[model samples]
Target: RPDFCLEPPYTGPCKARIIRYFYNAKAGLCQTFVYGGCRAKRNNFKSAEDCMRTCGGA
Candidate 1:
């Protein structure tokens, strides 16, 4: 699965798994972090693949 990003005002599924995408300039790929459905950011994604595809993650 793809990773996601985290901004704010998340409106995605609640009580579900979410990913946070972060661009690692040094690595030159979008990194990821686990986030609960309680909070979110603009870069939040549904899955790791989804986040990688969107954020250009390796």
Candidate 2:
């Protein structure tokens, strides 16, 4: 999932107040973001560990 890290953060505009994870390649870490939960999961993860595991930050 190396490519997953390079993907930009994508969130739906339909919903509100969702806790999601976005991988920031610049910081080389996974950070939390507010997601609408309506859009597809692209560079998002349910947890930081999952994001780290996929992005090689683990």
Candidate 3:
């Protein structure tokens, strides 16, 4: 769950509106901050194959 702190509280559609501020979301949820932008998950593995295996890919 992401808690977005707005000055006057959220009223309009955030999905359509654009603001010049930080859009911080709760941990473990999908976001667009990183490079992959919520499409990929972060992980640590010894080898590429291992990572692929963990994430279910060839």
Candidate 4:
């Protein structure tokens, strides 16, 4: 589950206010991205804490 993605599947329209973060191994930092209501990759996180917890901080 990568500790970043939403555990349950989201069913609805994409919300611009819903911002998610993910760890970019190449850059060695957490990056932000808009999360569309759908299936996201394992690296996607709903909070900075989750991202850091899994991939660490910059």
The prediction achieving the highest TM-score against the true structure is 2
Per residue, candidate 2 scores C-alpha lDDT tens digits across 1-58 of 5676777777777667788888888677888887876875668888888877777554
lDDT tens digits, residues 1-58, model 4?
A: 3434333323236554457777766565667766775666677777767777776733
lDDT for each residue of candidate 1 in 29-54, tens digit (9 for 90 to 100)? 55565566764664655554665677
How far does residue 40 in candidate 3 sit from its true spot (Å)? Answer: 18
lDDT of 3 by residue, 1-58 (tens): 1122211223233344332222222333222221222222233223434433444222
As for lDDT, the candidate ahead, 1 or 2, is 2
Say which prediction, candidate 3 or candidate 4, comes out ahead on lDDT: 4
Question: Is 1 or 3 the stronger prediction by TM-score?
Answer: 1
Cα lDDT, model 4, residue 39: 62
Question: Ten residues in a row with the worst lDDT in model 4?
Answer: 3-12
Which residue pairs in model 3 clash with each other?
none
TM agreement with the true structure for every prediction: 0.34, 0.73, 0.24, 0.55
TM-score of 4: 0.55
The model with the greatest lDDT is 2
For model 2 the local lDDT of residue 45 reads 88
Give the range where candidate 3 is weakest over 10 consecutive residues by summed lDDT: 1-10
lDDT for position 45 in model 3: 29
RMSD to the hidden true structure, all candidates: 7.0, 2.1, 13.9, 6.0
